[PDB]
Amino acid sequence: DISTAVVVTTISDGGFLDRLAPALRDAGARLIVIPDRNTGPALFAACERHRRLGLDVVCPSVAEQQDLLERLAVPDLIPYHSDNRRNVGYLMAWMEGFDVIVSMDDDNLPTTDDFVERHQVVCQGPRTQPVTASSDGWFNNCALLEVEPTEVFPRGFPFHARPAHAQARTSVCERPADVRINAGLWLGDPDVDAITRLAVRPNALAHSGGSVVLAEGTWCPVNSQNTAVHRDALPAYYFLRMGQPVDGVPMERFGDIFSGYFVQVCAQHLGHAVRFGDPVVEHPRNEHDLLDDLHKEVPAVRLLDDILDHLRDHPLEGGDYLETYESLSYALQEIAERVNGRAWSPDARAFLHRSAHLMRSWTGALRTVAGT
Amino acid sequence: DISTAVVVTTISDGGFLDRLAPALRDAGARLIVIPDRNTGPALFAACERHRRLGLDVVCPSVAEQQDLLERLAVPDLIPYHSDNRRNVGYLMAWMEGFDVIVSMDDDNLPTTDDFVERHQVVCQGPRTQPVTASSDGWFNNCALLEVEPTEVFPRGFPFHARPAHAQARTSVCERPADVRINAGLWLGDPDVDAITRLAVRPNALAHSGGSVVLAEGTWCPVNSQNTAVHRDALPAYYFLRMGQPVDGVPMERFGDIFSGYFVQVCAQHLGHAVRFGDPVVEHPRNEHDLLDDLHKEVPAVRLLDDILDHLRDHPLEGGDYLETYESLSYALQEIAERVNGRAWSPDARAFLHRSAHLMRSWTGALRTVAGT
Amino acid sequence: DISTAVVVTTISDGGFLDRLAPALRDAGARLIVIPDRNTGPALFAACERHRRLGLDVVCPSVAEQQDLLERLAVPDLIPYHSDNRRNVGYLMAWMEGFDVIVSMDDDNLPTTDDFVERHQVVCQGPRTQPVTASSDGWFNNCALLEVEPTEVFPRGFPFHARPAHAQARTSVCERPADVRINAGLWLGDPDVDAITRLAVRPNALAHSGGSVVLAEGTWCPVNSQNTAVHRDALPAYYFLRMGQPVDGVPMERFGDIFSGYFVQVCAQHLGHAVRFGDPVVEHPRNEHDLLDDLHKEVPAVRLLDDILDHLRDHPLEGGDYLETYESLSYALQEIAERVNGRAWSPDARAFLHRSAHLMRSWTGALRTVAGT
Amino acid sequence: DISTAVVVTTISDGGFLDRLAPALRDAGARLIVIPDRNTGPALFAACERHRRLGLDVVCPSVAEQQDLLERLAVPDLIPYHSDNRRNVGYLMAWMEGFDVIVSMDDDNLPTTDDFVERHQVVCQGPRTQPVTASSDGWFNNCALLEVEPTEVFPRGFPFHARPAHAQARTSVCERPADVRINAGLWLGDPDVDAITRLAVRPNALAHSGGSVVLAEGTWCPVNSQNTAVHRDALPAYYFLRMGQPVDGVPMERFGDIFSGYFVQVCAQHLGHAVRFGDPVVEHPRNEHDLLDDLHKEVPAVRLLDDILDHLRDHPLEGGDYLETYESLSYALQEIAERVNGRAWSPDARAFLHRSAHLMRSWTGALRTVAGT
Ligand SMILES: Nc1nc2c(ncn2[C@@H]2O[C@H](COP(=O)(O)OP(=O)(O)O)[C@@H](O)[C@H]2O)c(=O)[nH]1
Ligand SMILES: Nc1nc2c(ncn2[C@@H]2O[C@H](COP(=O)(O)OP(=O)(O)O)[C@@H](O)[C@H]2O)c(=O)[nH]1
Ligand SMILES: Nc1nc2c(ncn2[C@@H]2O[C@H](COP(=O)(O)OP(=O)(O)O)[C@@H](O)[C@H]2O)c(=O)[nH]1
Ligand SMILES: Nc1nc2c(ncn2[C@@H]2O[C@H](COP(=O)(O)OP(=O)(O)O)[C@@H](O)[C@H]2O)c(=O)[nH]1
Ligand SMILES: [Mg+2]
Ligand SMILES: [Mg+2]
Ligand SMILES: [Mg+2]
Ligand SMILES: [Mg+2]
Ligand SMILES: [Mg+2]
Ligand SMILES: [Mg+2]
Ligand SMILES: [Mg+2]
Ligand SMILES: [Mg+2]
Ligand SMILES: [Mg+2]
Ligand SMILES: [Mg+2]
Ligand SMILES: [Mg+2]
Incomplete structure (x- = not known):
C-alpha cells in the first residue's frame, strides 16, 4: 500500500482542478494545494467542490500555513507572493506520513x-x-x-x-x-x-x-x-x-x-x-x-x-x-x-x-x- | 575609379594583416587600423611591414587620433579601451573623401x-x-x-x-x-x-x-x-x-x-x-x-x-x-x-x-x- | 495692482489650509493647490470650504491637470506620486498672468x-x-x-x-x-x-x-x-x-x-x-x-x-x-x-x-x- | 614584564614610523606592520632602518602572509587591497603570545x-x-x-x-x-x-x-x-x-x-x-x-x-x-x-x-x- 500526495501551489481560481482531479481521484491520491496571499477565494470553493466530487484535496489557508510554520519556529522561512510556498505542502505531506510526494505545477x-x-x-x-x-x-x-x-x-x-x-x-x-x-x-x-x-x-x-x-x-x-x-x-x-x-x-x-x-x-x-x-x-x-x-x-x-x-x-x-x-x-x-x-x-x-x-x-x- | 577605405579597430599583434592584406592590396584599397591604449606595439610594426609590401595601410597613434578629435572639439566623444574607436576610422575615411568605407572586424x-x-x-x-x-x-x-x-x-x-x-x-x-x-x-x-x-x-x-x-x-x-x-x-x-x-x-x-x-x-x-x-x-x-x-x-x-x-x-x-x-x-x-x-x-x-x-x-x- | 498666486502640492487632508489661508485671503492672493493621484478627497472639501469663506483657492483634479498637460503637448512631462506636480501650479499661475508666483510647501x-x-x-x-x-x-x-x-x-x-x-x-x-x-x-x-x-x-x-x-x-x-x-x-x-x-x-x-x-x-x-x-x-x-x-x-x-x-x-x-x-x-x-x-x-x-x-x-x- | 604588540597595516612610504617608533621603542614594544599588494617598496626600507635604531618592527611580505594563511587553511579569508589585512597583524601577534595587542592606523x-x-x-x-x-x-x-x-x-x-x-x-x-x-x-x-x-x-x-x-x-x-x-x-x-x-x-x-x-x-x-x-x-x-x-x-x-x-x-x-x-x-x-x-x-x-x-x-x- 503506497500513500501518495501531490503538492501544488497556485494563485489561480481553481479551474486546473477540473482536468487534474481525475487521475488523482481514481488513484486515491491526496492533493495539497497551497494558496498564497494573492490567491483569490474562488480557489477555495473549487476545492470543496472537488472534495465533494470524491477527491481528497485539502487547501490550507495562509493563516493555517503560518500557524504551522510558527509552531515549528520557522515563521520567516517561506515568503508569500512566491511559488516558494511549495515547501509548505512538502512539509505537510511529510508530517502526515505519505510515502510518495509528487511535485506539480497547476x-x-x-x-x-x-x-x-x-x-x-x-x-x-x-x-x-x-x-x-x-x-x-x-x-x-x-x-x-x-x-x-x-x-x-x-x-x-x-x-x-x-x-x-x-x-x-x-x-x-x-x-x-x-x-x-x-x-x-x-x-x-x-x-x-x-x-x-x-x-x-x-x-x-x-x-x-x-x-x-x-x-x-x-x-x-x-x-x-x-x-x-x-x-x-x-x-x-x-x-x-x-x-x-x-x-x-x-x-x-x-x-x-x-x-x-x-x-x-x-x-x-x-x-x-x-x-x-x-x-x-x-x-x-x-x-x-x-x-x-x-x-x-x-x-x-x-x-x-x-x-x-x-x-x-x-x-x-x-x-x-x-x-x-x-x-x-x-x-x-x-x-x-x-x-x-x-x-x-x-x-x-x-x-x-x-x-x-x-x-x-x-x-x-x-x-x-x-x-x- | 572608386576609392575605398576598410576600417578596422584592434588591440592585437597585427597577425591578422597577413591573411587580410591580399584582397585589399590588390584592389588598391586603403586600410585604416584604429589601435587602442590596450594595444601592443607589435601591431604598428606589423603595419609598416605590410605597407612595405604594398598595402596602403595606416595606423594612427592614440596620440594622433586624440589630436584630431580635440581639433574637432570632440575630445570626449570616443572612449578608450573600447571598439567604439571604429568611429575615428570612419571619420578619417570620410575626411579624406573615400567613396566607399567598409567596416570590418580584425x-x-x-x-x-x-x-x-x-x-x-x-x-x-x-x-x-x-x-x-x-x-x-x-x-x-x-x-x-x-x-x-x-x-x-x-x-x-x-x-x-x-x-x-x-x-x-x-x-x-x-x-x-x-x-x-x-x-x-x-x-x-x-x-x-x-x-x-x-x-x-x-x-x-x-x-x-x-x-x-x-x-x-x-x-x-x-x-x-x-x-x-x-x-x-x-x-x-x-x-x-x-x-x-x-x-x-x-x-x-x-x-x-x-x-x-x-x-x-x-x-x-x-x-x-x-x-x-x-x-x-x-x-x-x-x-x-x-x-x-x-x-x-x-x-x-x-x-x-x-x-x-x-x-x-x-x-x-x-x-x-x-x-x-x-x-x-x-x-x-x-x-x-x-x-x-x-x-x-x-x-x-x-x-x-x-x-x-x-x-x-x-x-x-x-x-x-x-x-x- | 499686483496679482499674486501661491502654489502648493499636497497629499494632505487640507488641514494646513486652516492657518495658511488667513495671510493670503486678506491680501486677496490666489492659492493654487495641485493634488495628486495619491491624495485624499478630504482635501477638496477643505478647498471649497475656504472658497466660501473668502479665499480664492483653486485645486484642480488629476483629470483637469492631465487635460491641460495634454493640450500643451507634455502629457508625460510631470509624473504622478511626486511633489514634481508643483510645476502644474507654476504653469497655471504663469498662464493666468499673475505677477508673483510664490512657491510653498503645505x-x-x-x-x-x-x-x-x-x-x-x-x-x-x-x-x-x-x-x-x-x-x-x-x-x-x-x-x-x-x-x-x-x-x-x-x-x-x-x-x-x-x-x-x-x-x-x-x-x-x-x-x-x-x-x-x-x-x-x-x-x-x-x-x-x-x-x-x-x-x-x-x-x-x-x-x-x-x-x-x-x-x-x-x-x-x-x-x-x-x-x-x-x-x-x-x-x-x-x-x-x-x-x-x-x-x-x-x-x-x-x-x-x-x-x-x-x-x-x-x-x-x-x-x-x-x-x-x-x-x-x-x-x-x-x-x-x-x-x-x-x-x-x-x-x-x-x-x-x-x-x-x-x-x-x-x-x-x-x-x-x-x-x-x-x-x-x-x-x-x-x-x-x-x-x-x-x-x-x-x-x-x-x-x-x-x-x-x-x-x-x-x-x-x-x-x-x-x-x- | 608585559609584552605588547602594536598592529598597523599601511600602504604608505613608512614615513609614519619616525613619529611612532620612539614611544614604542622606548617601551620595548613590538610593532607589526602589515603591507599590502599596493604597498610601495619604500615602506620596507623604513622598517629596516627603524629596526637599526632599536625598534623591534616586523613587516611581513604579502608572500609571507599568504603562506601563513594557507597553512591555517584560510587562504581566502583576508582580501588584498584592503585595510582588512589588519587581521593578519592580530593573528600574528596572538600566535606569538603577546599579552596586549594595540590596533592603530598608520x-x-x-x-x-x-x-x-x-x-x-x-x-x-x-x-x-x-x-x-x-x-x-x-x-x-x-x-x-x-x-x-x-x-x-x-x-x-x-x-x-x-x-x-x-x-x-x-x-x-x-x-x-x-x-x-x-x-x-x-x-x-x-x-x-x-x-x-x-x-x-x-x-x-x-x-x-x-x-x-x-x-x-x-x-x-x-x-x-x-x-x-x-x-x-x-x-x-x-x-x-x-x-x-x-x-x-x-x-x-x-x-x-x-x-x-x-x-x-x-x-x-x-x-x-x-x-x-x-x-x-x-x-x-x-x-x-x-x-x-x-x-x-x-x-x-x-x-x-x-x-x-x-x-x-x-x-x-x-x-x-x-x-x-x-x-x-x-x-x-x-x-x-x-x-x-x-x-x-x-x-x-x-x-x-x-x-x-x-x-x-x-x-x-x-x-x-x-x-x-
Ligand atoms: N503561492 C504562489 N504561487 C505562485 C505565484 N506565482 C506563480 N505561482 C505558481 O507557480 C506555478 C507555475 O508558475 P509560472 O510563473 O506560471 O512559470 P512558467 O510556466 O515556467 O512560465 C503554478 O503552480 C502557479 O500557480 C505566487 O505569487 N504565489
Ligand atoms: N579599440 C578597441 N578595440 C577592441 C577592444 N576589445 C576588442 N576590440 C576589437 O573589437 C573587435 C571584435 O571583438 P570580439 O571581442 O572578438 O567579438 P565578436 O565581433 O563577437 O567576434 C575586434 O576588431 C577586436 O580587435 C578594446 O578594448 N578597444
Ligand atoms: N503631489 C504630491 N505631493 C507630495 C507627495 N509627497 C510629498 N508631497 C508634498 O511635499 C510637501 C512637503 O515636502 P516632504 O517631501 O513631505 O518633506 P520635507 O521636504 O522634508 O519638507 C507637502 O506639500 C506634500 O504635500 C506626493 O507623492 N505627491
Ligand atoms: N593593506 C591596506 N591598507 C590600507 C589600504 N587603504 C588604506 N589602508 C590603511 O588604512 C589606514 C587608514 O587609512 P585612511 O585612508 O587614512 O582612512 P581614514 O582615516 O578612515 O580616512 C592606513 O594605515 C592605510 O595604510 C589598502 O588598500 N590596503
Ligand atoms: Mg526506491
Ligand atoms: Mg527539483
Ligand atoms: Mg509552468
Ligand atoms: Mg557603425
Ligand atoms: Mg547606390
Ligand atoms: Mg570576433
Ligand atoms: Mg523687479
Ligand atoms: Mg527652488
Ligand atoms: Mg514637509
Ligand atoms: Mg574596533
Ligand atoms: Mg587616517
Whole structure:
C-alpha cells in the first residue's frame, strides 16, 4: 500500500482542478494545494467542490500555513507572493506520513490513466537494473523526447558541458539501483531555460526514448513540475528561496534547479538513484514575457556551472537525507568562498551563505517535527 | 575609379594583416587600423611591414587620433579601451573623401579576390531592380545562409517578430532602388546574439541564398563586421557608445545594432536601400565566455523591440544623412518619454537621451570638418 | 495692482489650509493647490470650504491637470506620486498672468500679516540698493538666522566651499539691482540638508540678520518652500524631476536645489538678482526617517559641487528667461560630457541629458501657450 | 614584564614610523606592520632602518602572509587591497603570545611617552572600581573631549539614540570590573562619521573628562585606530570584511565599527569591560574625499541601529571569546531573518550570513593555531 500526495501551489481560481482531479481521484491520491496571499477565494470553493466530487484535496489557508510554520519556529522561512510556498505542502505531506510526494505545477496535466502508479516507481526497492552512465557526467533527458525545431537541453543543464556533450559516451550497465526520485517529462512546452525558449521556441511532440536511471556520477537537472520524491528524500527537496541579487540583479525561476540537484547529490551519496521518463504531463505553451524570464534566470545561470563543478569535488557526510543535506549546506559555504570568476561578487558569494542557513532552518523544522 | 577605405579597430599583434592584406592590396584599397591604449606595439610594426609590401595601410597613434578629435572639439566623444574607436576610422575615411568605407572586424577574412569590388555595389546608383518586401516588415538575412543546426536570426533581430516571421509572405518586385549600405554575410560563427549562440551554437556553412535589396518598409539589422557604406550615409553610421545601464546593468556589444538600424532608417527616409548578401567573410568561432556576452547584450535586448516599434511610426525630417540623423536623435528623445514597459526605468530612458547627444556631437564633428 | 498666486502640492487632508489661508485671503492672493493621484478627497472639501469663506483657492483634479498637460503637448512631462506636480501650479499661475508666483510647501506657515506684501518685493523693478558679495562666490543665508546648536548651511550649499567660507570676505555696495526671486527664510526646522539635520538637528530660533540681495557672481541655494518668483523668471523655475540613479542609487529631494540654482543663473545672466530674507515662515520639525532622507539626497549631493563649478565657466545666451533656460539646458549637456570624478558614471551623466530634455519640454509647453 | 604588540597595516612610504617608533621603542614594544599588494617598496626600507635604531618592527611580505594563511587553511579569508589585512597583524601577534595587542592606523601618533604603559591597563585584572552606567544604554566617548564647534558622537554611535541622549542620566558606582579593551581617545580630527565630519568638521582640542569604564549594558562604539585588546579578547576582535552591498550599494569603512561592537558584546557576556580615555593620539585632519566616505558609510549606517537593537535581546553562550564569538555569529544569522525595515533587502540580509561564516573561518584559524 503506497500513500501518495501531490503538492501544488497556485494563485489561480481553481479551474486546473477540473482536468487534474481525475487521475488523482481514481488513484486515491491526496492533493495539497497551497494558496498564497494573492490567491483569490474562488480557489477555495473549487476545492470543496472537488472534495465533494470524491477527491481528497485539502487547501490550507495562509493563516493555517503560518500557524504551522510558527509552531515549528520557522515563521520567516517561506515568503508569500512566491511559488516558494511549495515547501509548505512538502512539509505537510511529510508530517502526515505519505510515502510518495509528487511535485506539480497547476498547469501540468497528466496524459495517462496510470500517472500516479508510474510515479510510485520511487517506492520500488533496490533492484539490479539497467543504469545509464555518460562519460562526461551528464545526461540530457530532453533526448528522450521528440522535440520539433532542433535538439534541446533541459532548464538548469550546465552550459560549459553542452558543446561537447554530443560526443560523450553513453553506456548502459546492470548495477544495483534504488530509485528515490522520479522526474517525469513533459510534452508541448518542455522544461527548457529562457535562453533556449527564446532561441527556438521548442515543441515536445512525443515521449519516444523510454525511461532511464542514472548511474552514480551522472547527473541531469530535476525540476519540481512533474516529479515524485520518496518520503526519505523529501528533507533534501527544499525549494530554494529566490530573489538574491547576483551583481545587483535578483535571481528567479531557479529554486527547483538547486533543489533537483541537491536531492540528487544527496541521493547518490546515500546510494540512491534518479529516474527520468514516464509518466509524462502536458505543459501548455504559456507564451507570456520571454525577455522577462531571461532577465530573471540569467543571475542563476551565471553561477550554476561553477557551483556544479565544485559539488563534484566535495565529499559529503551523513547517513540519511537530513544529515547529508545539512552537510551539503556547509559545503556550499566552503564553495561560496573558494569559487572564483566575474560573476562572483560579494552579493553572489553571500547568496550561497544565506541559502545554506535557509536549508538548515528547513531541516531544523523537520527535526522539530521528528524530535531530532 | 572608386576609392575605398576598410576600417578596422584592434588591440592585437597585427597577425591578422597577413591573411587580410591580399584582397585589399590588390584592389588598391586603403586600410585604416584604429589601435587602442590596450594595444601592443607589435601591431604598428606589423603595419609598416605590410605597407612595405604594398598595402596602403595606416595606423594612427592614440596620440594622433586624440589630436584630431580635440581639433574637432570632440575630445570626449570616443572612449578608450573600447571598439567604439571604429568611429575615428570612419571619420578619417570620410575626411579624406573615400567613396566607399567598409567596416570590418580584425578577425573577418575575405573569401574571394573581388571582395572590394563586390562591396562597391554601394557605388552603383539608383535603378529599377528586384526588391524584397516582407508582409511583417522584417527580413532574415540568415535565411540566405545554410546554417548547421537549425534556423537562426541575426543579432539585433527583434524578438517579438520572430515566432510569426516564418508565416510572413515575402515578395520580390521590380522597383527603383538606390543601394547605399551593403552588409556582407559570414561563414563560420554567424552574427547571432548571445542567446542564440548559447542555445544552438550555430554553424554557417555556405552562402547559398544570393543577395537581396530590401524594399521600403522591410528592415533587417546591419552589423559593422563586413559592411560597406557609401560616403553620403557614413554620417548616420556612428557606432553607438555602450555602457549605459538598463535597470542597473550596463549594456554592451550593441553599438552596431543601433548604428545599423539608424543608418537603415535614415536611408529609407532619403529613399535609399540596404543590400544583403555578398561579399562573404569567414568569421572564426572563438567564443570563450558566452555567458558574459549574454549578461552584456540582455539590457539592450530588453529595450530594442520597443525602440524599433516607435521608430516605424516616427516621421523624420532632413534632406541629407547628416540632417536626417540629427532629426533621428531628437526622435529618440521623444521616444524615450513615450515608451512604456517594465524595462524602462529612469536609467533606461536617460540612455536614449545621452545617446542622442552623442549622436549630434558626432555630426557636429562632421559639420566642422566640412565647413573648413 | 499686483496679482499674486501661491502654489502648493499636497497629499494632505487640507488641514494646513486652516492657518495658511488667513495671510493670503486678506491680501486677496490666489492659492493654487495641485493634488495628486495619491491624495485624499478630504482635501477638496477643505478647498471649497475656504472658497466660501473668502479665499480664492483653486485645486484642480488629476483629470483637469492631465487635460491641460495634454493640450500643451507634455502629457508625460510631470509624473504622478511626486511633489514634481508643483510645476502644474507654476504653469497655471504663469498662464493666468499673475505677477508673483510664490512657491510653498503645505507644512510652512507665514508668521506675519505682511507675508504676501514682503514677497511682492520682486515687482520693485531696478532700483539702486544695498547688494552683497562674497569673495568666494557664495553666501550662507542661514547666517541670517540664529540657529540653536551651531552654524549651519542651507540644503544645496556646495560642500567644497563650506570649510573656507567663514574666511571669505563679505562686502556691501549700493548699486542698481532688479530683484526677481525672493527666497524667504524659515524658523523652527531650517531647510538644511539631511547630513546637517542628522548631525546637529538644528533649530532656527529667530531671523536676526535682515535681508540681502546677492551681487552677480555670488550664489546661494534657493528652495521652493517659501520663495517668490516674478512672472518673467517663472520659465526657468521648472522643478527638476527626481528619480534618476547615480551609480545605481536614485536621487530625490533636490528638484528645487537645481531649480533654485537654474533660475538664479538665468536671472544673473539677464541682469536680475536674488533676494534672501523676509518674509519668514515657520517650518515644524517633521523629521521623518532622517536616514532615508540621507540615502535619497546623497546621489544628488555627489554631483552638485561639480555641476556648480562648470556652471561658473559656461556663458549662456538669451534675451529672456525662456531663451536663457534653453541655453542653460544645452550647457548642461556639454557639462555632462566634460566633467570627471568617481561619481560620474554613465547613469549620472545621462541624468543631465534627460533633465535637459525635460527642461526644454517645459519651455516648449510655455511657448505653446504664448505662441512661442 | 608585559609584552605588547602594536598592529598597523599601511600602504604608505613608512614615513609614519619616525613619529611612532620612539614611544614604542622606548617601551620595548613590538610593532607589526602589515603591507599590502599596493604597498610601495619604500615602506620596507623604513622598517629596516627603524629596526637599526632599536625598534623591534616586523613587516611581513604579502608572500609571507599568504603562506601563513594557507597553512591555517584560510587562504581566502583576508582580501588584498584592503585595510582588512589588519587581521593578519592580530593573528600574528596572538600566535606569538603577546599579552596586549594595540590596533592603530598608520596616521595616529602618540602624544605622550606613557602610550604603551597606559594601554597596559588592559592587563590589570578584575577589581572593584568606578564604573559608568547610562540610563539609555549608551555612552558618548566624545563627551570626554573638548570639541571646537559643537557636541559630536563617535563613528558608529547609533542614530536613533542620539536626539534623546543628552536627557539620559549617568551614574558612577563602585563595582567589580575587568578591563579587557582600552579605547584611547584622539585629538585633532576625532573619530566621527562622515555625516558629522561633513556637517561640523569637529576639532577635538583637549582630553578633559578623564577615563571611564562602562557598566554592563552601557555600550559605546570602539574603533581600531587606538585600541588595546587583551590576548583573551583578540578572538572576538576580527576586523569585519567590507564590500557587501546594501540595496546595491557596497558598504565600506565600518569593519571596526562591527568588530568594536562584537568584541564589546562578547566581553560583557564574559563579565569583562571596555575602557575609554587615555592614552590619546593626535589624528591629523586628513580631509580627503569626504563625499566618498559618506557614500561608502551610508549602507552600513542604514543597518547598524537594527543590528545593535537585536543584539541586546539576544542571549549568547560560551566560556571564552572564541566560543562566545562563534555563538554571536549564529545569532547574527538568526537576526538576519528577523530584522525588518526598508534597508533590509535580500543582499543586506545575506550580508550578515556571509559575515558570520567569515567570523567562524577566523575562529577556525585561531583554533588551528591552538590545537583545539
Ligand atoms: N503561492 C504562489 N504561487 C505562485 C505565484 N506565482 C506563480 N505561482 C505558481 O507557480 C506555478 C507555475 O508558475 P509560472 O510563473 O506560471 O512559470 P512558467 O510556466 O515556467 O512560465 C503554478 O503552480 C502557479 O500557480 C505566487 O505569487 N504565489
Ligand atoms: N579599440 C578597441 N578595440 C577592441 C577592444 N576589445 C576588442 N576590440 C576589437 O573589437 C573587435 C571584435 O571583438 P570580439 O571581442 O572578438 O567579438 P565578436 O565581433 O563577437 O567576434 C575586434 O576588431 C577586436 O580587435 C578594446 O578594448 N578597444
Ligand atoms: N503631489 C504630491 N505631493 C507630495 C507627495 N509627497 C510629498 N508631497 C508634498 O511635499 C510637501 C512637503 O515636502 P516632504 O517631501 O513631505 O518633506 P520635507 O521636504 O522634508 O519638507 C507637502 O506639500 C506634500 O504635500 C506626493 O507623492 N505627491
Ligand atoms: N593593506 C591596506 N591598507 C590600507 C589600504 N587603504 C588604506 N589602508 C590603511 O588604512 C589606514 C587608514 O587609512 P585612511 O585612508 O587614512 O582612512 P581614514 O582615516 O578612515 O580616512 C592606513 O594605515 C592605510 O595604510 C589598502 O588598500 N590596503
Ligand atoms: Mg509552468
Ligand atoms: Mg526506491
Ligand atoms: Mg527539483
Ligand atoms: Mg570576433
Ligand atoms: Mg547606390
Ligand atoms: Mg557603425
Ligand atoms: Mg514637509
Ligand atoms: Mg523687479
Ligand atoms: Mg527652488
Ligand atoms: Mg587616517
Ligand atoms: Mg574596533
